[PDB]
Design a protein around this ligand. Structure first.
Ligand SMILES: [Mg+2]
Lengths: 250, 211, 244, 235, 233, 222, 240, 231, 5
């Protein structure tokens, strides 16, 4: 018995390709379109909620996940792989940072920790790479707002705006035309909804779209008062109603 | 009581043969010199089992050396195997005093004092045991480098006899050894029962005792 | 059992080559070119970013040039994720040395240990090697300014000027042509950029597709300064040498 | 590929059978047992004339009463000798006596099959273990990587083994003297050796109860080679 | 390192011509408190062995479970489990003696004194003692705790040596045991009146007697004893 | 606190002749002031003409004897049924005892038999494995009573030749099996009189080339 | 842990992984060892396809194991560092326990033992390295030169070469080296070593490294000019 | 074919080829015979030599005073299994003061051989054993096969041409079973049984190996001049 | 225990 797979399942081919990473990226390509746009005063991350069945409650399945009060994540590719990465990403934010420094990690360093986990699945014994690309939007005091993409290889890049998955080629071209360095958060949400309508085929409403922002602090979402320095989470998930309001003036 | 001193004609090694369990004299015929090889001797003082067990073990390690290296082990290397061993057991309560006495080409006649608290000393003269001070008293006051083999053998024997007399936890008999360039030579077992009176009469010493 | 699916990453070819090391080098040959040039009064590190997108955040980005300590930096060629594993190890090794001896780690000692880790992955463990080649640029009070390279084999060598990644054959010929021993930092900066400008697979070399760093004694009196160039600083140095 | 500890359809371990092919490529080693002692002789086989032949150590002491000759991948024998020496000295420490030649051989042969997926492959070396004890007297053992050992009156291992073994079959009798056995090893070595036999490219040794295990000097062997040539020309 | 909490007192036993007798009171003491009164300290193993245990009752209950498991394990793949390959007293004893000495050697003893009484397959009487130290000894009479001090002297008057065993009947031997249990009730402060007695005979087999009481006691003379010296009233 | 050791009393005595050796021991087993057994043997035939007794803490004594008996069995298996010489047994027992140097067997061990020249041999061990071959050794509770008597009667210590002015010692000589058993019985009757832990019975094991014979004698039971 | 038996026997009785490790040695730059009457000289080839090198900091081909022993090699450079490190640790460990520096034979036997262990250990491949180990035993003036190879066999050599075109330079040494009369002086021994490398190298510029070891921990590496003088002298005598 | 790479793989017809190949190693092994009466159990073994200069490979191993076996196949595997039996016999003695039942000895060998046939990396034992013993239920003979299958028999034989001796014992069953209180006659029946497995070669003094255990007979092996009686 | 010159 015991795990006898102590050897790498990802190796270099004569051409210099890492087959399993390439094939993992192919799985991300098949995955549903998700995007992220960075504004001056916030970041927006959005994706289509591809429902497996109309009997299924798409509210229970959350494609956009809170990692820290000021950091959010969305993906394209294999949902199960994403779900366990979010679990590990939330825990590593505590164990390797918050329990040491008494504060949440900045976006770039949490991204760095997630990238490390995904790199290890590329080299460690008896495992395949993660079949997902992450978009991680976040805010911290000294770096401000930031948006990062994380690939199955463990490589991460900072983006002004980008898209991953099914219709990423067309969606990236659309964002190049619309993106400027003076975009307000509301303008970025508007462009996000326009970009996503191109890739979505069926119903396009607040129930089939999942969208969250990294914006201003939300004292109303904190859950307590009395500490002036604690002003509440910058991560907020837009409600089904809040999306439909912006789809009328589209 | 056991001593070993270096001189003109090589090394003299002398030991008593008594074993005690408190005030109970358990034996008068114990071998406190271990013959490691034709050129190496080990003296034994302290815990009987600790000394006896680890010095026979030392002999095994010295044999393995000359099998692997096709060459007799140095006195330095032999002493340091034992000192590094007892140092691993430091605080565990081992009780061992030993002098590793022998000859090699590169070293010449060499004596190493090794004890259970990790001390390892090269030296010309050592007296170890409960009666070491009695042996030192006689040995130091009569020792010269230019002693003859005959006089050196006697002084070593006489020094143990001195300790055998005064020290309650020393006696039985004297075991003499002489180490030369040609190896060690045994110079007999001398019972204190006969040796004391023989020395008293011939030397005129031990005037404290009723003749 | 599991024997069936084992690639056997740490074996010899009939010709006496390490398959996985050779294939890792093939991987690195497609990575953005990185150049190190060592002058008498400092070191230049120049690296070409891999086909940049216009919507990539350029100013808050790090792909090629990483800081190991105050005196040592590295240019990366290959898998970035692999490089970051090795960089964090190298950063820890430097701090272990400082903690032990109360002295900044000599450049070669850091390079040797990082190269010894790579070697390990080629001889035992049954894992794939790190698909990374480093250019180490650093200073210590023994040998002064030093350039090294390490590759997946775990073999390292010292250089006056060296290139890793894509078009090293063409890049090494151009460096060998115009390099000389009495060269200054400002001259080395110009050589580094001119070499990339000719060997690049891109149409034209621009500020947004480059990472640049110098290690000078240009600080105040007998102390070393590391300068990781900002986008605007690369834009200025590119105009000043007359490439744009 | 395939498992290391796999059986062939004929009921043999592939790796053990393949290791035996490696031993056939090895330099010749011959052992002859008599009532006056056991003789061990080896072909040194220097790969180049610049190689100092005296550094070729293919005959080895295990204890005063046990000697050893080897043939095959001789580098593999080092850990086997190390084990044998430790086993021999350890037994002397535990029992204040010399260890039986058979018990020593059995201890070495227990390592043999301690391979698989323990070490990664069998030993690529065969050993001739010669010795003396009070019980069974002068003995010669052939220790294989199969974990099997046979006692032999005489035995040849290495490249010229099957030719040398056929010669030992005819020549060996129960009344051989030590001197007769010495010449017989030299005679059979000279027949199966590629290059011409001399004191530099061949080595003799013996184990006697009185003097224990002794490797012969190049001066002593040279005289036995000269004595051998004269006796063959004398009829 | 332990300290015994709930404890059982003396276990007494002796050999007779055809077998062995063993007895022990039914008390589980909690220091000076006589807390439990329905405790069986004689545990039969098959139809040819009885293990009498004194000392810590939690450790006694552990040993019960081991012996119960030993019978189960012996039955496995054993067609002769109720015949030639049935558990012998000597097998059961040596097992317990091994465990007791292993536990003392790990400085975590079973805080007990055990007497294994039984009859071997060849009809030979078996009687052997083992305790928390792993100390073992055999004698025509064996007793634990106060039994060693007060019972042995009385039982040795019947069987003083080996040659007295064939001369001792089950009637005489049982009478001596029952008398010894009365003396222990007089003089042991952690003893009870209620006890169990077991006879293992090579002919009549295992006879297990429960709910026996000490009787025919002498107390009448107490009424005549007044004061502690001078007092007349 | 739990004390893992106990004192089971008793005393043992080994004497070596020219072509024989005896190992005697009383059969009394005690704890404190109580008698556990009047007949509990502690002198055992271990095979290969070796007799052994480990007197002191019975539990440790039984464990050691048990382990040595097992050592003899495996010596046969591993070395082609070779006979374990008394000198080889002694060294083996040193390693058994010293193996527990930091949690000792609380026993004085004596073994007796014949050396490889056929001459009577007695070896004596301390609790942690220090051993010595002797003509004579008493061990256990009454060793301090018996041993000086053996020095006097076996090794003729402090005995000089009459009329030689205390100059010529009484010459050493081997004792007959008859004379040795007299000294053993007188040693144990003397020890029984003056030591409370000694009595009940005396069991002697005599070892010759022919094998191991037993002799039993009653001792006072008070 | 990774357990796979990589070094295994083939039907014909060969261990291909050990034999393929020898191919890696055959690819490596040429290394030569020549021992004279009172010295040993280690010559080493450096391939001239690498210009713009920094010869100050570039790892030297000859490594000091102790003050009295040196190790050169042919084959995988990365593999050689692991053997050198282990050898240097064993050299200090020997001084600590035996209170005497290693003999050249002992240090060789250790390095050879390490190489052998990697030929029948699970999860590891053999060292793609052959070594020349040279020096002088403590308080001894007899020159020592040993060779090791991936299999783990080692032996003593009057003179020996390893690496690429080693069969050519071995051919040269076999006729030019006299056993009865070895190079009497340092100059004679260095010249024969340089001559032997000039059969293979190409140019005698910055391609040849020479290290001279003498008794009592007397080791020195020759500079470019010092070596170039031997190259200039040999070529002028050749034209005859 | 494709299903004989390791012991962990079943064939399409439900066969374990590595176990069958291990069974093949026994057939190549030298013949050995086992038979018993009610009072005694006897092992007879034809020993094999490399050549005339070599010794004869010892086939019989003692496990306890009351138990031992003969081997056919890989001798080192017999050493491992015999050593295991020695320890189990010894454990039974030290812990329970109880001689190990020959039936339990078989059960323990079966379970030890089985574990090697269900796990990756390991291999089956390449040896067959004939275990004889005398315990509390009289004389016993067991046949061990490295598949794990252990069988209690009146008589049997394993090794090359074992079918000859096995046929003879199948005919002689009624005769030799009632050889009670007569060691020499039970051996004679065993020596005559193994003689039915001989081709070109005959039983010599240093060729034949006999072992016996019984009621008042410890397990003892007879070799050399001690077997000259039975030729 | 034990013996201890
Ligand atoms: Mg008394």
């Amino acid at each position: 018995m015991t795990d006898r797979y102590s050897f790498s399942l990802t190796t270099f081919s004569p051409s210099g390709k890492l087959g399993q990473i390439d094939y993992a990226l192919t799985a991300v390509k098949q995955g549903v379109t998700s995007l992220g746009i960075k504004a001056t005063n916030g970041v927006v991350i959005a994706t289509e909620k591809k429902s497996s069945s109309p009997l299924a409650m798409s509210e229970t399945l959350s494609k956009v996940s809170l990692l820290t009060p000021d950091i959010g994540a969305v993906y394209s590719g294999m949902g199960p792989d994403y779900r366990v990465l979010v679990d590990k990403s939330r825990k590593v934010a505590h164990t390797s940072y918050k329990r040491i420094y008494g504060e949440y990690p900045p976006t770039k360093l949490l991204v760095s920790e997630v990238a490390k986990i995904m790199q290890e699945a590329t080299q460690s014994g008896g495992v395949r790479p993660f079949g997902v690309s992450l978009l991680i939007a976040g805010h911290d005091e000294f770096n401000g707002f930031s948006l990062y993409q994380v690939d199955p290889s463990g490589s991460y890049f900072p983006w002004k705006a980008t898209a991953i998955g099914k219709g990423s080629v067309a969606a990236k071209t659309f964002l190049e035309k619309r993106w400027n360095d003076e975009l307000e958060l509301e303008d970025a949400i508007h462009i996000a909804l326009l970009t996503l309508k191109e890739s979505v085929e069926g119903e396009f409403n607040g129930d089939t779209i999942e969208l969250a922002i990294i914006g201003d602090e939300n004292p109303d979402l904190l859950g307590y008062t009395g500490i002036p320095t604690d002003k509440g989470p910058r991560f907020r998930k837009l409600t089904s109603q809040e999306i439909n309001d912006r789809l009328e003036a589209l | 009581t056991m001593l070993a001193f270096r001189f003109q004609g090589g090394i003299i090694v002398a030991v008593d043969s008594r074993a005690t369990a408190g005030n109970w004299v358990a034996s008068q015929t114990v071998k406190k010199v271990i013959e490691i090889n034709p050129f190496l001797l080990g003296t034994m003082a302290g815990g009987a089992a600790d000394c006896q067990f680890w010095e026979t073990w030392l002999g095994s390690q010295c044999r393995l050396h000359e099998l692997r290296e096709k060459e007799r082990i140095s006195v330095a290397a032999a002493s340091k195997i034992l000192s590094n061993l007892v140092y691993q057991y430091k605080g565990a309560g081992l009780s061992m005093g030993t002098m590793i006495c022998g000859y090699t080409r590169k070293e010449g006649p060499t004596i190493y004092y090794v004890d259970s608290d990790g001390t390892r000393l090269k030296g010309d003269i050592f007296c170890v045991g409960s009666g070491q001070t009695f042996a030192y008293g006689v040995l130091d006051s009569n020792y010269k480098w230019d002693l003859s083999v005959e006089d050196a053998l006697y002084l070593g024997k006489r020094s143990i006899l001195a300790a055998a007399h005064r020290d309650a936890y020393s006696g039985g008999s004297v075991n003499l050894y002489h180490v030369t360039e040609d190896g060690w030579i045994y110079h007999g077992n001398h019972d204190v029962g006969e040796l004391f009176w023989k020395v008293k009469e011939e030397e005129g010493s031990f005037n404290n005792v009723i003749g | 059992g599991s024997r069936r699916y084992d690639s056997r990453t740490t074996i010899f070819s009939p010709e006496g080559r390490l398959y996985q090391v050779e294939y890792a080098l093939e991987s690195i040959s497609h990575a953005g070119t990185a150049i190190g040039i060592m002058a008498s009064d400092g070191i230049v590190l120049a690296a070409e970013r891999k086909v940049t997108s216009t919507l990539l955040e350029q100013d808050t980005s790090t792909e090629k040039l990483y800081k190991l300590n105050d005196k040592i930096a590295v240019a990366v060629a290959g898998l970035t994720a692999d490089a970051e594993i090795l960089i964090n190890t190298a950063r820890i090794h430097a701090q272990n040395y400082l903690k032990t001896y109360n002295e900044d780690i000599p450049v070669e000692i850091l390079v040797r240990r990082l190269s010894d880790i790579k070697q390990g992955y080629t001889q035992h463990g049954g894992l794939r090697p790190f698909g990374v080649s480093f250019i180490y640029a650093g200073y210590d009070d023994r040998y002064g300014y030093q350039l090294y390279t390490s590759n997946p084999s775990g073999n390292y060598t010292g250089w006056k000027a060296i290139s890793v990644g894509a078009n090293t054959s063409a890049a090494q010929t151009l460096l060998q042509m115009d390099y000389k021993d009495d060269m200054k930092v400002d001259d080395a900066i110009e050589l580094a950029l001119k070499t990339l400008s000719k060997t690049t697979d891109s149409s034209a070399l621009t500020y947004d597709r480059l990472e640049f760093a110098t290690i000078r004694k240009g600080a105040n009196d007998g102390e070393v300064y590391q300068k990781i160039f900002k986008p605007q600083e690369i834009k200025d140095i590119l105009v000043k040498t007359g490439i744009t | 590929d395939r498992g290391v500890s796999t059986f062939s359809p004929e009921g043999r371990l592939f790796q053990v059978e393949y290791s035996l092919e490696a031993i056939k490529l090895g330099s010749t080693a011959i052992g002859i047992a008599t009532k006056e002692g056991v003789v061990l002789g080896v072909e040194k086989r220097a790969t180049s004339p610049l190689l100092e032949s005296d550094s070729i150590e293919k005959i080895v002491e295990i204890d005063r009463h046990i000697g050893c000759a080897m043939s095959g991948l001789t580098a593999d024998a080092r850990s086997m000798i190390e084990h044998a020496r430790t086993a021999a000295v350890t037994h002397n420490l535990y029992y204040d006596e010399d260890i039986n030649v058979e018990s020593l051989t059995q201890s070495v042969c227990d390592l043999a099959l301690r391979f698989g997926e323990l070490m990664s492959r069998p030993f690529g070396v065969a050993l001739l273990i010669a010795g003396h004890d009070a019980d069974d007297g002068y003995q010669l053992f052939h220790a294989e990587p199969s974990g099997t050992f046979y006692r032999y009156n005489a035995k040849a291992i290495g490249s010229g083994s099957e030719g040398a073994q056929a010669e030992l079959l005819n020549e060996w009798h129960s009344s051989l003297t030590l001197k007769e056995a010495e010449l017989l090893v030299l005679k059979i070595l000279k027949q199966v050796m590629e290059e011409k036999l001399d004191e530099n490219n061949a080595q003799l040794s013996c184990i006697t109860k009185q003097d224990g295990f002794k490797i012969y000097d190049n001066e002593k062997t040279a005289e036995l080679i000269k004595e051998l040539k004269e006796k063959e020309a004398a009829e | 390192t332990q300290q015994p909490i709930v404890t059982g007192t003396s276990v007494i036993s002796m050999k007779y011509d055809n077998g062995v007798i063993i007895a022990a009171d039914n008390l589980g003491s909690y220091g000076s408190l006589l807390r439990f009164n329905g405790v069986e300290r004689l545990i039969p193993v098959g139809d040819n062995t009885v293990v009498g245990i004194s000392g810590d009752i939690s450790d006694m209950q552990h040993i019960e479970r081991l012996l119960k498991d030993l019978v189960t394990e012996n039955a496995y793949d054993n067609p002769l489990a109720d015949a030639e390959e049935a558990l012998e007293p000597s097998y059961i004893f040596e097992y317990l003696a091994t465990v007791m000495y292993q536990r003392r050697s790990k400085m975590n003893p079973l805080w007990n004194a055990i007497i294994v009484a039984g009859v071997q397959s060849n009809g030979d009487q078996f009687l052997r003692y083992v305790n928390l130290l792993g100390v073992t000894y055999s004698s025509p009479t064996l007793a634990t705790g106060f039994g060693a001090h007060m019972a042995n002297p009385l039982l040795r008057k019947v069987v003083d040596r080996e040659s007295d065993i064939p001369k001792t009947t089950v009637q005489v031997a049982e009478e001596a045991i029952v008398n010894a249990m009365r003396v222990l009730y007089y003089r042991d402060a952690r003893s009870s009146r209620n006890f169990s007695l077991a006879i293992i005979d090579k002919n009549t087999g295992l006879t297990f007697k429960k709910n026996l009481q000490v009787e025919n006691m002498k107390w009448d003379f107490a009424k005549d004893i007044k004061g502690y010296g001078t007092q007349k009233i | 606190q739990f004390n893992p050791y106990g004192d089971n009393g008793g005393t043992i005595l080994g004497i070596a002749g020219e072509d024989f050796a005896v190992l005697a021991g009383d059969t009394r087993n005690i704890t404190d002031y109580s008698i556990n057994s009047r007949y509990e043997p502690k002198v055992f035939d271990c095979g290969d003409n070796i007799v052994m007794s480990a007197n002191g803490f019975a539990a440790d004594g039984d464990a050691l004897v048990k382990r040595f008996k097992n050592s003899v069995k495996w010596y046969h298996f591993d070395h082609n049924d070779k006979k374990l010489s008394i000198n080889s047994a002694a060294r083996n027992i040193q390693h058994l005892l010293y193996g527990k140097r930091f949690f000792p067997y609380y026993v004085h061990t004596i073994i007796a038999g014949l050396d490889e020249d056929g001459k009577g041999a007695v070896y004596s061990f301390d609790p942690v494995g220090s051993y010595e071959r002797e003509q004579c050794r008493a061990g256990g509770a009454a060793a301090s009573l018996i041993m000086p008597f053996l020095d006097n009667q076996v090794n003729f210590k402090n005995q000089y030749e009459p009329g030689t002015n205390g100059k010529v010692k009484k010459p050493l000589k081997y004792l007959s099996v008859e004379e040795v058993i007299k000294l053993v019985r007188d040693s144990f009757t003397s020890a029984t009189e003056r030591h409370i832990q000694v009595g009940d019975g005396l069991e002697i094991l005599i070892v010759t080339k022919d094998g191991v014979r037993k002799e039993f004698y009653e001792l006072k039971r008070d | 842990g990774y357990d796979r038996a990589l070094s295994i026997f083939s039907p014909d009785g060969h261990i291909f992984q050990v034999e393929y490790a020898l191919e890696a040695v055959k690819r490596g730059t040429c290394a030569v060892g020549v021992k004279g009457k009172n010295c040993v000289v280690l010559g080493c080839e450096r391939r001239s396809t690498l210009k713009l090198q920094d010869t100050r900091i570039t790892p030297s081909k000859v490594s000091k194991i102790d003050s009295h022993v040196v190790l050169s090699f042919s084959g995988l450079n990365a593999d050689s560092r692991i053997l050198i490190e282990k050898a240097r640790v064993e050299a200090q460990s020997h001084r600590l326990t035996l209170e005497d520096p290693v003999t050249v034979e002992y240090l060789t036997r250790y390095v050879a033992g390490v190489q052998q262990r990697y030929t029948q250990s699970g999860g590891v491949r053999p060292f793609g390295v052959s070594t020349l180990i040279a020096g002088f035993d403590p308080r001894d003036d007899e020159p020592k030169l040993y060779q090791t190879e991936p299999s783990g066999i080692y032996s003593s050599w009057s003179a020996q070469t390893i690496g690429r075109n080693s069969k050519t330079v071995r051919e040269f040494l076999e006729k030019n080296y006299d056993r009865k009369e070895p190079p009497a002086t340092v100059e004679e021994c260095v010249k024969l070593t340089v001559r032997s490398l000039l059969e293979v190298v190409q140019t005698g510029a910055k391609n040849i490294e020479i290290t001279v070891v003498k008794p009592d921990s007397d080791i020195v590496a020759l500079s470019s000019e010092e070596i170039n003088q031997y190259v200039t002298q040999i070529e002028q005598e050749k034209q005859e | 074919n494709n299903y004989d790479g390791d012991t962990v793989t079943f064939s399409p017809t439900g066969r374990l080829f590595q176990v069958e190949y291990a069974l093949e190693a026994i057939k190549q092994g030298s013949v050995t015979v086992g038979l018993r009466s009610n009072t005694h159990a006897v092992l007879v073994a034809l020993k094999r030599n490399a050549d005339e200069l070599s010794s004869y490979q010892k086939k019989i191993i003692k496990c306890d005073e009351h138990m031992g076996l003969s081997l056919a196949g890989l001798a080192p595997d017999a050493r491992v299994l015999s050593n295991y039996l020695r320890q189990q016999c010894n454990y039974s003695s030290l812990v329970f003061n109880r001689k190990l039942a020959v039936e339990r000895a078989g059960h323990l060998l079966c379970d030890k051989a089985q574990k090697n046939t269900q796990s990756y990396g390991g291999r089956p034992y390449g040896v067959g054993l004939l275990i004889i013993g005398y315990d509390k239920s009289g004389a016993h003979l067991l046949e061990f096969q490295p598949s794990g299958n252990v069988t209690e028999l009146y008589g049997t034989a394993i090794g090359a041409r074992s079918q000859g001796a096995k046929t003879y014992l199948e005919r002689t069953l009624d005769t030799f079973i009632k050889i009670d209180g007569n060691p020499d006659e039970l051996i004679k029946a065993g020596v005559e049984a193994i003689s039915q497995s001989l081709r070109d070669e005959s039983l010599t003094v240093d060729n034949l190996s006999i072992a016996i255990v019984g009621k008042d007979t410890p397990f003892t092996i007879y070799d050399g001049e001690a077997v000259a009686k039975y030729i | 225990x034990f013996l201890f010159x």
